């Protein structure tokens, strides 16, 4: 899946409130950040005996994750989050479809 | 065990023991589902009708 | 080795022919449907004698071939192979299944059958009027190869046509009758007059 890395979408930036240009990056999660409350509760609950308390999930079934485009307005730096479908490949760069050219390999 | 999966035998006897009702229409339906532009004007087209009715009677 | 003809005798399931979902149909064993002097003209054989089913059933492809052999063998040994035109007017298109404890029961194709209505013609023999009792006994022996009950109806048509013997005659001194390979073409009051002249020119005299 090919997505352009520059987009003209609506901005909820309270100054644009219109279609502006957006620079587009793919969204990655970010680190778990200990001292989150559910992580501190995880630390106090695993201590002692009896072992694992919360479930440890195993039967994963998806070959894919939905890709989230993490946009940013070029004018007011107000960011957006768009979501696409499941895809085994996600290409953010260029390499557009040249039509009348000979195949190879 | 092996079980009878599905049948609609006896389902219309129960459907008629309490007598199927048509949905009991009313004068003045709800304006949910109307074109919101039309409903928006209809608030004013009936407000001013009441002003021209209430002032003309008094 | 084969299930008897009483097993699939009655029509209990729908017509199940050979197409893009069956794909594995075992072929029939009646593959000849016209017999005798099939290239005789219409006028040589004026007398159509029929085998007609009085019961709604299935004739099998084995049975239609076996009755064809028996009826052909009698008529040639009495009057010869150019004294009749035996036409089997029945084609076995219906495919029968077979299952081979009750699980995965859906079947694999077994044999070919031919659904015949009450009043449907099985066989038709056209011949001369002198050879009539030969043809009946040739068809009377062919009854034994068939389940159900079959009738020997002397038709009133002229041969293998759809018009009666005197109706075919008044069309014959008149010019609406002319030969083809196996059958006879007829004249109409319709179409272009030039094509009514190209073919059929003995008319308009």
């Amino acid at each position: 899946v090919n997505v352009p890395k520059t987009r003209k979408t609506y901005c909820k930036g309270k100054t644009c409130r219109k279609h502006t240009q957006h620079k587009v990056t793919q969204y990655k999660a970010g680190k778990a950040s200990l001292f989150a409350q559910g992580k501190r509760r995880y630390d106090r609950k695993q201590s002692g005996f009896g072992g694992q308390t919360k479930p440890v999930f195993h039967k994963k079934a998806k070959t894919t994750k939905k890709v989230v485009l993490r946009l940013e307005c070029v004018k007011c730096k107000t960011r957006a989050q768009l979501t696409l479908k499941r895809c085994k490949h996600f290409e953010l760069g260029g390499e557009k479809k040249q039509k009348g050219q000979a195949l190879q390999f | 065990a092996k079980s009878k999966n599905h049948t609609a035998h006896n389902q219309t006897r129960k459907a008629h023991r309490n007598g199927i009702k048509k949905p009991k229409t009313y004068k003045y339906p709800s304006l949910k589902g109307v074109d919101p532009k039309f409903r928006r004007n209809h608030k004013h087209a009936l407000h001013g009708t009441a002003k021209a009715l209430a002032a003309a009677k008094k | 080795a084969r299930r008897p003809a009483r097993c699939y005798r009655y029509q209990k399931n729908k017509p199940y022919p050979k197409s893009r979902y069956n794909r594995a149909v075992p072929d029939s064993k009646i593959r000849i449907y016209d017999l005798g002097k099939k290239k005789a003209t219409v006028d040589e054989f004026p007398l159509c004698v029929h085998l007609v089913s009085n019961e709604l059933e299935q004739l099998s492809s084995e049975a239609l071939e076996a009755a064809r052999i028996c009826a052909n063998k009698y008529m040639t040994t009495v009057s010869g192979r150019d004294a009749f035109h035996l036409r089997v007017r029945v084609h076995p298109f219906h495919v029968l299944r077979i299952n081979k404890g009750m699980r995965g029961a859906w079947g694999k194709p077994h044999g070919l059958a031919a659904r015949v209505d009450i009043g449907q013609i099985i066989f038709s023999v056209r011949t001369k009027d002198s050879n009539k009792d030969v043809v009946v006994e040739g068809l009377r022996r062919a009854r034994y190869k068939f389940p159900g009950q079959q009738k020997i109806i002397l038709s009133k048509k002229w041969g293998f046509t759809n018009l009666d013997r005197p109706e075919y005659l008044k069309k014959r001194e008149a010019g609406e009758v002319k030969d083809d390979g196996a059958f006879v073409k007829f004249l109409s009051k319709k179409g272009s007059l030039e094509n009514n002249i190209r073919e059929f020119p003995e008319y308009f005299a």
Partner: protein
């Protein structure tokens, strides 16, 4: 497994009515729908947007909402032991007027008209419709028409 999609079992129903494929003729787009008009739902397969679900093909209902290209139609749907009000957003090329309601509304104009000369004279003009009443007396003549038929025919096979 089993398939229960939106256009399931709609093979012949959404088909396009032999030798009448192609574009929608323009009288469909010139028809005028008002709220309260009673319309017959028949989906045109060549228009895939605004297309009713297969339950509503042939159903008849009342226009309640009017948008740019679509009417809002109310259909009564039997669900279990009662009917529920179904509100459908269908474009006007799946929709025609019910010709019965044109036949009704002229009879309303007729019964208004027939009661007018009931007010000139002769009250109770008997304007209600009646069923096919039994026939009256006849006297059937025989002049040129003497009664003749023969008997039942015998059995012939006529093949």
């Amino acid at each position: 497994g089993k398939s229960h999609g939106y256009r399931s079992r709609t093979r012949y129903m959404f088909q396009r009515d032999f030798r009448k494929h192609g574009a929608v003729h323009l009288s469909t787009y010139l028809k005028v729908y008002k709220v309260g008009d009673i319309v017959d739902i028949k989906a045109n397969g060549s228009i895939q947007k605004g297309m009713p679900h297969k339950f509503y093909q042939g159903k008849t209902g009342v226009v309640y909402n009017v948008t740019k290209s679509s009417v809002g139609v109310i259909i009564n749907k039997m669900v279990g032991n009662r009917y529920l009000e179904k509100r459908l957003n269908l474009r006007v090329e799946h929709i025609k007027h019910s010709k019965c309601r044109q036949e009704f509304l002229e009879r309303v104009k007729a019964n208004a008209a027939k009661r007018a000369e009931a007010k000139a004279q002769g009250v109770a003009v008997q304007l209600k419709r009646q069923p096919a009443q039994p026939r009256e007396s006849r006297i059937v003549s025989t002049e040129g028409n003497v009664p003749q038929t023969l008997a039942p025919v015998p059995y012939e096979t006529f093949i």
